């Protein structure tokens, strides 16, 4: 049998790969050619395109922002599974002011209003998520590593669930 | 696929079990263990298989008597003397094996085989006893005083086996019940209590020399053999289906389902142990260190998230061999709205096995079943267990070692084909106690047993 | 012997450095993944079970177990037998349990328990119970009135990972707030789980009405009312730091090699810091006595248990007071014993074969470190209250004498179910854990024989003369209706 | 096994009882008996094998089945070693040369001698694990041991019942 | 030194707060600034006739 | 939840966060959540009167 | 070889609250015990289906709540 043959070959492959250092954490000296591209071309893209395409990006993001009196992470939709995992568990005190600034920015941007030059002398990209988002991502890798590492065989469009996977009914069309 | 050799050291730092043959037939095996207490007792090959159709029962009701006195001792007496010597005696009757063992000190050893030398060979059946024991069989055989766990087992193997002995109970029924006599007993001691078919287990602080030494003297006048046993034909195995709708008796449902499975020495046995070790049991009410949602048992997992609710109050898997056959299957306690999904999946769990089982779950599997037979021979009434059944059973008992040696070389693999063989596309036996309106028809649930993906 | 702790001399273990890399290679080997895999048809396929097929077994080393111990640097106590089973028994005891609560603190003890095997510094909750999932692994943690157990329940050779995980719970456990606030659902199972035992629901009715509000008496399970407000991380961690400590904590271990166990114990709290050692109120017990009526509107039988306080472990009563019990013995309709089962105990023949109205009549010893309680617990129906309590007081009148032959009987079953319970693993586990944190010793069965042995009548009627001068404590469950009032019971054992 | 086909037990007993005096009256010695039987046999046996699980410990049927499990592995165990000392004589015969001159001889066994006595220890254990099929032992195993005899001189314990 | 259980307690996601955060966090009291038309401009003077009928 | 998908995969050209954070990774670590200051209670930058003077 | 325990391991402790080793009575027979080796009324064999849990069924109690409804909240189309 041959699959008989692939999988001795997969099992004898992964094998003399466990441990190994992840691209990212080895000291990697940049290539002569890269370093010629990286002294030449680089400096110049950056003064005359990218840097200047980027600040004018930049800059108008940090006033829209201002406009609408909220925060960078404020602007982070809910339906990314990672922030919604995340928001589950922020302290009360940040989560109160986090909606209220969403609301405020709501309401302004309906009403194509602006918020008071009086009120917008803030940072607007403070990272007063970044903690939660972390959490959330080590326990969802967590559960992908420990309860996900297969495709699972389950009974087809039984109790309101598809059986491929989604844990809510009626969460598909097929499913109604 | 194969992953190495799990045996250790010290599974072979055990003490070596000892079986002779005495010269009229009996079996003595022993194992010594530095305990303070003793286990020794006769396991019997005797049992309800092997009674008639019009005389079953006798052998519980003889079971239930046999401890009532002697022709040498009294009742009081015999219970003064057992007291005193700070021990206890137990007995059970099955199907197709029975035991009379008694738990004592290490004093008590040789004393107790006296004793229970004395009950086998020499039981006083007083009129008297025989009579009161009557109303407390006849008691116990009502239904309403049977919990339904112990009405499902008994009624798996009245459909599973309609044409053979198995299919009778242990009990009898009451017509029996009612007509046991002295004569009966005294029939089925000679015909079946025989040193042909005992087997005298001593585990503890012992010696064997001088254990085979008091056994041949205490049961010297044993009737050395019975007539040897008719030759029968394979037990068929009937797919029937044998409910009993109870709209009366509160929310929940009891079902079980059983495939054929295999005998004792089949060499599939095993793989039909670890099987039954995937399947495993669940109780909402004791969950574990691990939550259902959250499972590494793919039937636990499954059934934990469906309605949100959870669709198995309680589920075990059961591995039930004989001589000849065996019994296959799972057993279902649930709310009576969820019996069509638990049914649904524990046989969506049994038909996995020939498609699709991961080498993880074998492997947990393996090491929990590994867990469960090895703390059952922690204590000396368990390793007296393991040997008399085993012995019984095989002619022998199996190391630990050779345990483990043969539960190394079963994979993934070779669970998928004993289930290809033998549990795909199988014929099933369906039983229930309950409210059972969401059980379908057996024909329905049989066709579970294959998928039309893979 | 290096040091004696409490009356018993321990073996030191001293702390040693030692490289991650160098330990890396003596931990179990063990997969979570299988991603390919050698195929190899099973060779045994053919072969019948009746047919042996292991040969050139390696001949058996067998070595009597004896119970060693050792301490660590940290003050961590190590009691171990080796029995040479193929399961083992990791249990860690710590000697914080509910009669160390202020009243302000009612319920920590349980909400520690419910927080077992969550995060840890170095693994996360799914990542721990995961583990001890795939390693095939049983066990969890119960809290009682004097200590808090965490067991685990192995197959040896995993035996260095699962030492690591039981510890983890007491030294860097991470109370997270979500992961402490989904502990709350416990409460509810707790108290399900304890009412369905209708015996030790009458146990925990009796501890509270005989130690009025003090240490024993100290509900067991948090309330999941008002005690919610501190079932919160930062309280738990508060409650942890006043009374878990490496000084009062006792690993023991049934069937694992002592040195492997010392050394990966050591390991495991090497280059960390256990929770400091602090003086605690430690009060003695005060017995009250006093009387409750539950009432059970399901239940129609009456359970009525009457008590009186013991002197509890450490005294020279123990040993008598438990012939006692078992000299009085009981027993149940429901069950039907065979001989040497209690037939021919005081309360089965006085009692079970002369009031066929009595559904079943036992005596209880219950036992903690320096307090206890002893009575007669006997069951009925509702209407037969007002006779079943007559029938237990004639029974505690009847102590004033006897006979040999009862004593004789009593010593030898007492000692036949100290041997018979003793080989039980975890239940020795369990009671080495509970002697050194009740008294810092361990009595071995055979000792307790001893002892058994050198009972006389006279220590019987001493022990039980001091029993019945205590205020009694009466407690009925069930169907209460008809039960007599508690100064009923207190005058007719007032003449005792 | 994977069948759909039902069998008495007195079809069981009689399949058995056929294949293990089938086994134990061929001729073990000559190898294309063997080769061209095992096949057959191999096929044979795991029918009878699945029709008689429910027989292991019936007095008739049980004792065939065991004595056939035995012969099987007797057969396979005595066969390994007599290819092996086929392959020693090949070897000298081929030592020899072409006609027995030795004009294209190929060259021959060294340690010959240590290759008959690894020869001789497996025909004794042979003989200690096989006890009930000495006859068959000696058909195969013994008359290669008593050809290799002739070539080098070595002793073995029934070598002065193999007129040596 | 310091006992593990209180060194990673310190390590809650919650003990971590971006510097700055309460210096520069809007905290808003009404989603209508000073200066936004609301209900109290628009509303009509008492003395309005039935605005039902047109 | 619906049928998702989160692209938690091991990148062959990003870094992941804990060896590249993509934010100001300057943080104030409390012993305690409630020795944080409280915002509400907070002075804010001062405010500006044109746009080319805020922060 | 027979298997004498049920699959589903209890993980509770043996020795009820306060009682010890010695004064538990006989854990093999007595009533109390948690480890009693239960009775033959009408036959051996009914262990392989016995639920061993002591606390009773309560018919659909819920254990797939992964937290998103509070208790006593019904679920309507599974939201
Ligand atoms: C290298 C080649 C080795 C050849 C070996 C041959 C051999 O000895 O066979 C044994 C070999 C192994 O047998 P085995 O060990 O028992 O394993 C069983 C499995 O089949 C073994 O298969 P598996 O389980 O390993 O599954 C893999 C299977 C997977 O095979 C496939 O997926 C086949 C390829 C995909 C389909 C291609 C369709 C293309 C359509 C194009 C359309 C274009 C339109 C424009 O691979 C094969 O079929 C062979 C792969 C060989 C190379 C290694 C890969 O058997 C096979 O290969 C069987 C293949 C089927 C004619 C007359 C007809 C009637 C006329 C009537 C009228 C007159
Ligand atoms: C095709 C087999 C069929 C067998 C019979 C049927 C049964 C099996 C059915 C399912 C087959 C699935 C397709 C397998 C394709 C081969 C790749 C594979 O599994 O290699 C194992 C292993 C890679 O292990 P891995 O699973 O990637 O795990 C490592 C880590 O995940 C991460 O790895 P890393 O980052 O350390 O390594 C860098 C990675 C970076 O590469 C990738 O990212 C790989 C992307 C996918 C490549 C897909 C290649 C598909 C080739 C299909 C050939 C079909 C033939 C059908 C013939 C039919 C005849 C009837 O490099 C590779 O993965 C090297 C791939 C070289 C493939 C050469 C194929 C020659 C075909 C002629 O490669 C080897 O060492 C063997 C290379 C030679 C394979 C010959 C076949
Ligand atoms: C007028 C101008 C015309 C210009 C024409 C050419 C323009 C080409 C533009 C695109 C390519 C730029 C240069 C690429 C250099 C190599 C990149 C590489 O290796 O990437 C790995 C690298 C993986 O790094 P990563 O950061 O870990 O990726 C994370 C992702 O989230 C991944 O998420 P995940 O973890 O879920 O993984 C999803 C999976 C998804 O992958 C798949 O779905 C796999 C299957 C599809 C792709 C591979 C097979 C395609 C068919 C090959 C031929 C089969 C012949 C069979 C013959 C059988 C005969 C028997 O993909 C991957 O894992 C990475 C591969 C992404 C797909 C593309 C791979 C091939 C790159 C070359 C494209 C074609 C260049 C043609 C040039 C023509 C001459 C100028 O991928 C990237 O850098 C990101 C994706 C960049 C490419 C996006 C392509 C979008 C789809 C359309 C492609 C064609 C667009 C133009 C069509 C114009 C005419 C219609
Ligand atoms: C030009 C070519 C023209 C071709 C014309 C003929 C086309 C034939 C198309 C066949 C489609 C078969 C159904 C869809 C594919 C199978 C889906 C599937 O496995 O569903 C599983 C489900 C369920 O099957 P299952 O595999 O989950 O098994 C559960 C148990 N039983 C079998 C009792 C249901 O299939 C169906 O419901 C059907
Ligand atoms: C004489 C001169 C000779 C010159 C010869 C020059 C030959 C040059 C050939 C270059 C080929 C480069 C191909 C790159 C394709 C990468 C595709 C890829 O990422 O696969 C995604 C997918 C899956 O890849 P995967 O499953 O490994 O996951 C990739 C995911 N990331 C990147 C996040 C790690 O590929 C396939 O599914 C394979 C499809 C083909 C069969
Ligand atoms: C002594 O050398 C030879 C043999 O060994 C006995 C042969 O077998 C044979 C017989 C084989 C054939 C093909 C006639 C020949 C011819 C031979 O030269």
């Known amino acids: 049998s041959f699959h008989r043959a692939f999988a001795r070959v997969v099992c004898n492959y992964n094998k003399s790969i466990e441990g190994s250092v992840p691209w990212y954490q080895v000291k990697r000296e940049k290539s002569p050619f890269q370093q010629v591209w990286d002294e030449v071309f680089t400096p110049i893209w950056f003064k005359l395109v990218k840097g200047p395409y980027e600040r004018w990006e930049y800059n108008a993001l940090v006033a829209r922002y201002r406009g609408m009196g909220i925060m960078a992470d404020d602007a982070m939709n809910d339906k990314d599974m990672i922030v919604e995992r995340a928001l589950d568990i922020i302290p009360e005190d940040i989560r109160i002011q986090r909606y209220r600034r969403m609301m405020r920015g709501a309401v302004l941007a309906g009403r194509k209003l602006h918020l008071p030059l009086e009120l917008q002398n803030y940072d607007p990209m403070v990272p007063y998520m970044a903690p939660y988002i972390e959490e959330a991502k080590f326990q969802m890798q967590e559960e992908q590593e420990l309860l996900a590492y297969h495709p699972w065989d389950r009974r087809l469009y039984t109790a309101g669930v598809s059986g491929f996977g989604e844990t809510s009914m009626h969460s598909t069309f097929l499913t109604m | 696929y194969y992953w190495g050799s799990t045996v250790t050291t010290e599974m072979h730092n055990v003490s070596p079990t000892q079986v002779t043959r005495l010269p009229n037939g009996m079996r003595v095996a022993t194992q010594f263990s530095y305990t303070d207490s003793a286990t020794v007792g006769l396991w019997i090959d005797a049992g309800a298989r092997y009674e008639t159709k019009e005389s079953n029962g006798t052998a519980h009701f003889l079971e239930r008597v046999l401890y009532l006195g002697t022709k040498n001792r009294s009742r009081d007496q015999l219970e003064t003397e057992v007291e005193n010597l700070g021990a206890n005696l137990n007995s059970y009757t099955g199907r197709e094996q029975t035991a009379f063992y008694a738990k004592t000190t290490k004093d008590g050893i040789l004393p107790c085989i006296d004793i229970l030398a004395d009950c086998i060979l020499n039981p006083k059946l007083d009129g008297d006893e025989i009579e009161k024991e009557r109303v407390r069989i006849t008691q116990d055989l009502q239904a309403v005083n049977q919990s339904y766990e112990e009405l499902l087992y008994d009624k798996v193997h009245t459909a599973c086996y309609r044409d053979c002995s198995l299919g009778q109970t242990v009990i009898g029924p009451e017509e029996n019940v009612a007509t046991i006599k002295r004569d009966h007993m005294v029939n089925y001691l000679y015909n079946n209590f025989t040193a042909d078919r005992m087997v005298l287990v001593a585990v503890g602080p012992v010696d064997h020399a001088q254990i085979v030494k008091e056994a041949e003297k205490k049961f010297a006048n044993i009737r050395p053999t019975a007539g040897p046993r008719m030759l029968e034909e394979k037990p068929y195995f009937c797919a029937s289906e044998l409910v009993y709708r109870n709209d009366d008796m509160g929310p929940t449902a009891h079902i079980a389902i059983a495939y054929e499975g295999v005998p004792w020495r089949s060499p599939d046995y095993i793989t039909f142990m670890l099987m039954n070790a995937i399947i495993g049991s669940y109780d909402k009410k004791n969950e574990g260190l691990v939550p259902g949602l959250q499972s590494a048992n793919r039937i636990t997992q499954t059934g934990a998230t469906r309605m949100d609710v959870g669709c198995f109050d309680y589920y075990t898997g059961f591995n039930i061999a004989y001589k000849d056959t065996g019994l296959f299957g799972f057993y279902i306690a649930t709310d009576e709205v969820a019996v069509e999904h638990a049914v649904g999946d524990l046989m969506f769990g049994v038909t996995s096995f020939s498609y699709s089982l991961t080498e993880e779950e074998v492997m947990k599997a393996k090491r929990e079943l590994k867990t469960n037979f090895f703390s059952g021979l922690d204590n000396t009434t368990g390793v007296a267990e393991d040997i008399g059944r085993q012995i019984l059973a095989y002619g022998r008992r199996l190391s630990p070692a050779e345990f483990v040696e043969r539960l190394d070389q079963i994979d993934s693999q070779e669970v998928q084909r004993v289930a290809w063989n033998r549990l795909h596309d199988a014929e099933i036996t369906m039983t229930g106690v309950g409210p059972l309106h969401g059980l379908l028809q057996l024909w329905d649930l049989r066709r579970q047993t294959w998928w039309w993906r893979y | ?496 | 096994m994977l069948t759909v086909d039902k069998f008495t037990r007195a079809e069981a007993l009689q399949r058995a009882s056929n294949l293990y005096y089938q086994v134990l009256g061929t001729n073990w010695e000559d190898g294309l008996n063997l080769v061209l039987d095992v096949p057959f046999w191999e096929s044979e046996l795991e029918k009878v094998d699945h029709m008689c699980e429910p027989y292991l410990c019936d007095d008739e049927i049980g004792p065939i089945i065991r004595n056939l499990h035995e012969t099987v592995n007797c057969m396979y165990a005595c066969e390994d070693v007599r290819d092996h000392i086929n392959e020693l004589l090949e070897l000298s015969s081929r030592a020899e040369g072409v006609m027995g001159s030795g004009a294209a001889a190929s060259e021959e066994v060294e340690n010959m001698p240590e290759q008959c006595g690894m020869v001789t220890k497996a025909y004794e254990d042979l003989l200690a694990r096989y006890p009930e099929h000495h006859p068959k032992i000696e058909q195969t195993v013994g008359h290669g041991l008593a050809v290799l005899r002739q070539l080098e001189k070595f002793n073995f314990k029934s070598s002065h019942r193999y007129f040596f | 030194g310091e006992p593990a259980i209180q060194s990673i307690a310190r390590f809650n996601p919650d003990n971590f707060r971006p510097v700055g955060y309460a210096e520069n966090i809007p905290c808003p009291d009404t989603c209508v600034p000073e200066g936004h038309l609301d209900f109290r401009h628009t509303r009509l003077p008492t003395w309005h006739a039935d605005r039902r009928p047109f | 939840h619906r049928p998702t998908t989160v692209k938690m995969i091991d990148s062959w050209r990003t870094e992941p966060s804990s060896e590249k954070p993509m934010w100001y990774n300057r943080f104030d670590q409390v012993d305690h959540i409630s020795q944080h200051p409280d915002p509400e209670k907070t002075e804010k930058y001062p405010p500006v009167d044109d746009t080319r003077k805020l922060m | 070889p027979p298997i004498q325990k049920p699959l589903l391991p209890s993980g509770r402790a043996v020795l009820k609250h306060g009682r010890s080793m010695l004064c538990s009575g006989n854990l093999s027979y007595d009533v109390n015990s948690t480890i009693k080796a239960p009775e033959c009324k009408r036959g051996m064999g009914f262990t392989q289906f016995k639920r061993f849990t002591p606390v009773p069924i309560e018919s659909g109690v819920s254990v797939g709540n992964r937290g998103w409804f509070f208790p006593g909240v019904i679920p309507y189309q599974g939201h």
């Open chain 3, 1 to 496: 012997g290096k040091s004696t702790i409490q009356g018993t001399s321990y073996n030191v273990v001293k702390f040693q450095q030692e490289d991650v890399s160098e330990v890396v290679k003596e931990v179990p080997h063990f997969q979570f993944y299988y991603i390919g895999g050698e195929h190899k048809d099973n060779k045994y396929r053919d072969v019948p079970l009746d047919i042996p097929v292991l040969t050139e077994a390696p001949p058996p080393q067998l070595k009597k177990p004896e119970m060693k111990f050792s301490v660590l640097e940290n003050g961590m106590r190590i009691v171990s037998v080796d029995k040479q089973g193929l399961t083992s028994n990791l249990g860690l005891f710590v000697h914080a349990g509910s009669r160390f609560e202020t009243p302000a603190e009612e319920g920590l003890s349980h909400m520690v328990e419910c927080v077992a095997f969550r995060s840890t510094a170095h693994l996360s909750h799914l990542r721990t119970i995961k583990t001890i999932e795939v390693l095939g692994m049983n066990g969890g943690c119960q809290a009682g009135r004097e200590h808090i157990m965490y067991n685990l329940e192995l197959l040896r050779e995993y035996m260095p990972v699962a030492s690591t995980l039981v510890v983890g719970n007491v030294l860097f456990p991470r109370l997270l707030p979500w992961e402490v606030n989904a502990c709350h659902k416990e409460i509810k199972k707790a108290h399900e789980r304890l009412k369905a035992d209708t015996d030790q629901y009458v146990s925990e009715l009796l501890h509270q009405t005989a130690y009025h509000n003090n240490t024993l008496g100290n509900a067991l399970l948090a309330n999941e009312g008002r005690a919610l407000e501190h079932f919160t991380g930062d309280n738990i961690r508060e409650f942890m730091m006043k009374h878990f400590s490496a000084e009062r904590s006792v690993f023991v271990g049934i069937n694992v090699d002592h040195d492997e166990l010392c050394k990966w114990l050591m390991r495991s709290f090497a280059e960390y810091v256990a929770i400091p050692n602090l003086p605690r109120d430690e009060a003695k017990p005060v017995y009250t006595g006093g009387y409750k009526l539950e009432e059970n509107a399901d239940m129609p039988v009456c359970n009525i248990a009457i008590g009186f306080e013991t002197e509890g472990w450490n005294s020279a009563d123990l040993v008598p007071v438990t012939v006692l019990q078992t000299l009085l013995g009981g027993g149940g309709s429901f069950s039907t014993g065979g001989p040497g089962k209690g037939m021919h105990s005081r309360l089965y023949l006085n009692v079970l074969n002369q009031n066929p109205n009595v559904e079943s009549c036992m005596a209880f010893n219950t036992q903690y470190s320096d307090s206890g309680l002893f009575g007669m617990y006997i069951t009925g129906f509702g209407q037969e209250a007002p006779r079943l309590v007559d029938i237990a007081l004639n029974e505690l009148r009847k102590l004033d004498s006897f006979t040999p032959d009862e004593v004789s009987r009593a010593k030898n079953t007492l000692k036949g179910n100290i041997f018979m319970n003793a080989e039980n693993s975890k239940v020795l586990m369990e009671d080495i854990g509970r002697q050194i944190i009740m008294s810092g010793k361990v009595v071995t069965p055979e000792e307790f024989a001893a002892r058994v042995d050198a009972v006389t009548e006279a220590d019987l009627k001493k022990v039980a003369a001091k029993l019945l001068r205590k205020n009694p404590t009466y407690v009925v469950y069930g169907d209460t209706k008809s039960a007599p009032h508690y100064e009923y019971v207190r005058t007719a054992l007032a003449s005792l």
